[PDB]
Amino acid sequence: KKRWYVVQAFSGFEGRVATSLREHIKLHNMEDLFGEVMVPTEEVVEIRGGQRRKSERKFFPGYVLVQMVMNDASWHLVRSVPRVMGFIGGTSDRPAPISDKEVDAIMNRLQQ
Amino acid sequence: PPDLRPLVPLDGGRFATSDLNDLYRRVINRNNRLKRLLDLAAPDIIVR
Amino acid sequence: MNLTELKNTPVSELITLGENMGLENLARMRKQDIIFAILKQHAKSGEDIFGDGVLEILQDGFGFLRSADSSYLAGPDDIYVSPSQIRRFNLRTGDTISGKIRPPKEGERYFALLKVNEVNFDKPENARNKILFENLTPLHANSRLRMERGNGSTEDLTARVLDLASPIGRGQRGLIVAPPKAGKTMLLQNIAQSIAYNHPDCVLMVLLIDERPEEVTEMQRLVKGEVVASTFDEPASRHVQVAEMVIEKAKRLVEHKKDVIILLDSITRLARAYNTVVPASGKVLTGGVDANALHRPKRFFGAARNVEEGGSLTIIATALIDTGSKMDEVIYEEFKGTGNMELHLSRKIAEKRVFPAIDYNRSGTRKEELLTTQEELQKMWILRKIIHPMGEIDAMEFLINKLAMTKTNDDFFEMMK
Amino acid sequence: MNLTELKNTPVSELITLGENMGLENLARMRKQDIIFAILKQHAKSGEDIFGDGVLEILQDGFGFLRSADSSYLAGPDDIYVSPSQIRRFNLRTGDTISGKIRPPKEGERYFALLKVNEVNFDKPENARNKILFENLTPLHANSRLRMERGNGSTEDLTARVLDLASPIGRGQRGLIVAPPKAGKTMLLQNIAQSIAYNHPDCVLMVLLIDERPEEVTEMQRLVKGEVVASTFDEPASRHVQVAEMVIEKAKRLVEHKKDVIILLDSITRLARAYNTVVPASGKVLTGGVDANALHRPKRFFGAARNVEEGGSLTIIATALIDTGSKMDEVIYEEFKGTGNMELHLSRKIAEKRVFPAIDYNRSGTRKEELLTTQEELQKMWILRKIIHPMGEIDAMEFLINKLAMTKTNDDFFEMMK
DNA sequence: GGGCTGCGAATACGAGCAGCTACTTGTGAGCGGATA
DNA sequence: TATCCGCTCACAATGCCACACGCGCTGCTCGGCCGTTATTCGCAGCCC
RNA sequence: GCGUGUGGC
């Protein structure tokens, strides 16, 4: 199953982590094994100033996570890239994903 | 106490700030992030 | 309970129910403050509160529902709303939000909007599906807005001259070119009465900029519509704020496909206010006007357009000339091409006490053929050919003498045969 | 996929395919923003993207392909291009570039042009071999651009008066000397219809400067050509930017050996805008004009010339006089010698409702013998000798009465025997 | 008598988070850990 | 299951004195405020 | 406030 495995990267550069991981997956043409990097982490909320409506539209706890199937080689691919500060999940090196309730919760959060 | 922790206006745009103040700021930021996680019904692994 | 029901009533009744539910002596605070105290006292009984007002989004993202008491300013009776609802229901400045609210808790200063029930007289979930104002294609005026009452009293003819000199339609952009002391106030009186009588469906809005408070309390008790004003006793910042908020409410309303009309005295005073608030750019013109100061007044006036999808937005402003300073002259100069509808008034006739003192040939309507029929517009052309070779005062007095006999303008055309 | 195919369609269809490929509710963002979101959503499926637009080279060297949605302004739908291609294919401002593009990556804000396929309707490697606009030798108008339709309806004669008062040709420099409220809009309507009908090969371009949006949506739906406009609701900076970009596109097109025609209402408004953006030099003239402010409008108008190598560039602008301020008068003064083609209009005739209200003897064409034949130009001279001793209104009405019977101007000459 | 100073009345997006070694020896205790 | 035995980690490195310098930029991410609180001036007690 | 470099008892 295309599981929603969670991982934490270098904060602040989390968008840079998202694009680096996206480019790495698109280079190795492994789309049939991996998925997205949680682009919905874009809360359009902003500080709307007068006469200047520049809105970055970025507000989320971060935690760039990739939808992926558990494999050792794939783990080595996703750790070979930079910004692998923490590969969270209760395990030695092979974690478990989260149930679909939290997936529906984050889908609601994206809906808002 | 504030007057006790090193924070003195240095020459220029920079000011000498205690190294403990960085850890204090990081602790407060992590506590705020934790408070935000539990309020949003976050998964168990992220709050862990 | 609703706020406006407690805001429209006099203060004495507020004191009565205040001491009825066990409160202090309420003859000491402001009418706004008395309303606020009554609201908290009735709210501390554990009951569902309701509020309504125009939304003003702050710099930080959150919003405030202002009420029409102080022309929607910063007040204690404003309802604070979080950006979360402003993003869910996608609200902006000018959206009239109404729904269930709750009292401010200790450490809080303003009511909080909990449930939204109606957004700009529409269902709130319907407010998400909309097109923004700068996105629809304008048009010319198609549906004729006849301002003639038909009863033909001594002042009804005041509107007929309009239908005889400059026809008005939906989405038109009108302004009065008149010197001071001509009678602009009573012409606005007649036109507002005509809007309330003939076409009561369109939203009748009157904006007063830097005028006497007697005119404010006179218009607010004559027409049955939202009258927002800004007298001279307030700074220019408040005037441009009211400009922001009224143009935003009109924009949201026409986005809701509604016909709105905004009446303005004066556009020169609003231009003065905008000149007052604009930062210095270093290029001043004759009269004391800045180079980039008139952009916002030009926007505010030219917001008028006829909507293709539905609704219309009309602006009827007044300008001052023969005032003594170059400023108002250049105002009329760069505002003379911005509008497509003019009421030229002659002080020359006002000195002879011949009301209305309207200048016929200098006035007109741009693309007026789309509001009138063929033979009717031909009647207009023949009437223009009759009035043009004649003078000013003699032609105007002849026009009023010809209208004094009949009441309806079609009947006047019928006798004109 | 192509961008314009998704930009011309209404927004509702965009929402349909948006939720078809699994996107949000698209009834909330701007039409430009809805186009951008649809573009990213269709681009994230791994497919070859195509784009097209006019190039605007920035200060730093790189460029942006703007689209005709907002009259080619700064927008999120602009395609960023690196200076490397701008040097390889040697592109400049005004070059219409079209080719394969890719989506903006994270941290990037605009699409990137990867493959160029067509530069100004030509092969991109052919754009390297070209002569620059300031380098070719001008000429007089040789090929006659007959604006007569030949069907002779009640408005076709409107163009015939042109062929009877001021002949037009390729590379000519035309402007209308007309007071306000004369009917310039409908004469431009007729001339644009005549260009679309008689000579559909030349590029028909209409530039609107500080006019009503109803005229914009009317012209953009009447003629089948690129209509770029700049209403009064936008600052003067945008107006002079559109001047830059439209004159640059015309320059690139005539460098590509093409016949282009640019229609302008108004040149006085563009001069006002240029006056607005020019820094102060300390020498102001009568009317509020600067000493070195009219150089750029003079360039923009006099860019018209007939090309020896191939192509032509024609400018038909409109000027305002009898407005009340010295400014527009001096505008017509120093612009009266810059053009070689004049349409003098009489408000005197417009008051008598005799359309077209054209002044015959004050109008004319400079070096008009190179567009007409010998006996035909002699016919023109005899017609001028007939109209000259006569008055203004009587001569104009006699001209319209003589054209009401026949449709083709050669047939009119044939009955004139 | 007058300056010095306390006392009360009139009034009107920016901060923060974050990224792009391997010649030391000696002394002590703690935590596995093998074997009868 | 007890008895030491072997592997692993914390902790130490005078005391001072003198002089000098050295402490980065940009792309995500988070919180959130009124013109009735704080500024400024008129007036009078108290010391010189 | 420290670090680094250098020198001296």
Ligand SMILES: Nc1ncnc2c1ncn2[C@@H]1O[C@H](COP(=O)(O)OP(=O)(O)O)[C@@H](O)[C@H]1O
């Ligand atoms: N060829 C024509 N046929 C009929 N009516 C015309 C014609 N030309 C002009 N008009 C009349 O003149 C008016 C033109 O208005 P407008 O375009 O604003 O004039 P201008 O462009 O000269 O300011 C219209 O109301 C129309 O009725």
Ligand code: BEF
């Ligand atoms: F178009 Be009109 F002459 F103002």
Ligand SMILES: [Mg+2]
């Ligand atoms: Mg016109």
